[PDB]
Homo-oligomer: A and B are copies of this chain.
Amino acid sequence: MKIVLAYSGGLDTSIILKWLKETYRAEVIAFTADIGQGEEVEEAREKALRTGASKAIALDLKEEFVRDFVFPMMRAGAVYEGYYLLGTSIARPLIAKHLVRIAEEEGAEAIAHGATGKGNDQVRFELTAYALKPDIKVIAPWREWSFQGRKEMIAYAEAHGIPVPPYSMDANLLHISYEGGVLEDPWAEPPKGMFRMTQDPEEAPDAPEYVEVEFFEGDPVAVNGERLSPAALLQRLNEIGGRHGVGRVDIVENRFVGMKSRGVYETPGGTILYHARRAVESLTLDREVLHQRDMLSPKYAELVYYGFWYAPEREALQAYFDHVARSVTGVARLKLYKGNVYVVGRKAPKSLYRGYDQKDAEGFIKIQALRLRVRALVER
């Protein structure tokens, strides 16, 4: 029996690698994806072999991540519960996609991940796995073992020679998420110094910085006149937005499995892209199309948040969003200053910005008012 483990190189997946070998008397193939966490994945791959993996794989997936998951999501204007730009949410389908592919190639009957039984990640990983390979076997150790606390887990790792290192973090090219520990009290502000991807607004440059972002067909293709690949472009905007402290959100969200959770997120590049997109859309999209689009975005957002990426509903809505986004061609000009992003200009080759006479308005108004006047007369 072989098992493809989503291995991040940390303590838990290291413990998991050992636990899987003994518990399932299985050969474990480790997989570590480079999605912009800011770590040398090769070090994780080598730790996996030291830990006991029969094979360890590491892949640079930053470009596939931005082009095939982040970009399509952004085209939809996806925002969960008013603020969450879904940084962790869209990255999970990508990881599981490769787990299942590797499982196929290696002849493995199962896959494993270290997401807990109380979060969203477990759902995202498994819904994707099942959607792509229906008879795949999934093993989620957190829902199968009986560790009674951290102490017991550190003891288990020390016993296997696994080296042992106030909140939980998840970082990738789109954002860095923070939750748990001290963050659990929604009345308490995050502690100073917690953020890593964005500069503290109180420490941002004293002068504002202008940035231009070009969109061609619904996707951003250039920054300040320089054409950049998907991953390179997000990276650049992260650098630019980050220096100014842009993209910080603090919310109490509703998880898919039932409870509320306090989360903090920094999405510098994606936040600039959100406003840049809407800026270009303001000139290229039709009024009714836009209004219909905005009423569907929230639904799309929850699909991503819940884990229904490789699902027919999401694919169907994507057909609508992509259609609409094809008209988003132009340039947005933004002004960045101490934590904030300001749209300051926009232009487009086929802008709809700027015939009748005042007289037509009276008619328009009379007809629009008819049903209201009738209703009024009936009330008498």
Q: Give me the interface of A with B, judged by CB distance under 8 Å.
A: 81-83, 116-118, 122-123, 126-127, 130-134, 140, 142-144, 186-190, 201-202, 206, 208, 248-254, 257-262, 278, 282-283, 286-296, 298-299, 302, 308, 310-313, 315-317, 319-320, 322-324, 333, 335, 337-340, 342-347, 350-379
- Give 9 closest A-B pairs by Cβ, nearest first: A363-B363, A117-B358, A258-B370, A254-B287, A134-B373, A360-B363, A319-B323, A143-B358, A364-B367
Q: A364: which B residues are within 8 A, CB to CB?
A: 123, 257, 360, 363-364, 366-368
- B367 with A356: CB separation less than 8 A: yes
- A354 with B289: CB separation less than 8 A: no
Q: A286-B371, A288-B311 are in contact. List 19 more A-B contacts (CB 8 A).
A: A81-B290, A81-B294, A122-B365, A142-B358, A201-B338, A252-B346, A254-B371, A258-B370, A259-B371, A260-B352, A286-B312, A291-B302, A316-B323, A355-B370, A356-B370, A359-B363, A360-B366, A363-B367, A364-B367
- B378 with A350: CB separation less than 8 A: yes
**Closest residue of chain B to A322, judged by CB?**
B319
19 A-B pairs with CB atoms under 8 Å apart are A117-B362, A127-B368, A130-B365, A142-B358, A187-B347, A189-B335, A201-B337, A249-B343, A257-B370, A260-B353, A261-B353, A287-B371, A291-B298, A291-B299, A311-B372, A352-B375, A356-B363, A359-B363, A361-B363
Give complex CA distance A276, B296 in Å. 25
Give complex CA distance A356, B312 in Å. 21
Known: A131-B372, A131-B375, A369-B130. A362 touches B360 (CB 8 A): yes
From B127, B206, B293, B362, contact of A369 by CB (8 A): B127
Known: A283-B186, A313-B289. A361 touches B118 (CB 8 A): yes
Q: A116: which B residues are within 8 A, CB to CB?
A: 358
Most chain B beta-carbon neighbours within 10 Å: one of A81, A253, A287: A287
Q: How many copies of this chain sit in the oligomeric assembly? A: 4
From B140, B249, B288, contact of A313 by CB (8 A): B288
Q: A132: which B residues are within 8 A, CB to CB?
A: 376
- B298 with A282: CB separation less than 8 A: no
- B366 with A356: CB separation less than 8 A: yes
- A259 with B311: CB separation less than 8 A: no
Nearest-Cβ distance from residue A28 to partner chain B, whole angstroms: 21
**Closest residue of chain B to A378, judged by CB?**
B350
Nearest-Cβ distance from residue A284 to partner chain B, whole angstroms: 9
Known: A250-B342, A344-B189, A370-B257. A376 touches B283 (CB 8 A): no
From B251, B344, B368, contact of A190 by CB (8 A): B344
- A324 with B333: CB separation less than 8 A: no
- A126 with B292: CB separation less than 8 A: no
Q: A202: which B residues are within 8 A, CB to CB?
A: 206, 208, 337
Give complex CA distance A6, B83 in Å. 40
Known: A201-B337, A367-B356. A361 touches B286 (CB 8 A): no
Nearest-Cβ distance from residue A123 to partner chain B, whole angstroms: 6
From B189, B310, B333, B370, contact of A259 by CB (8 A): B370
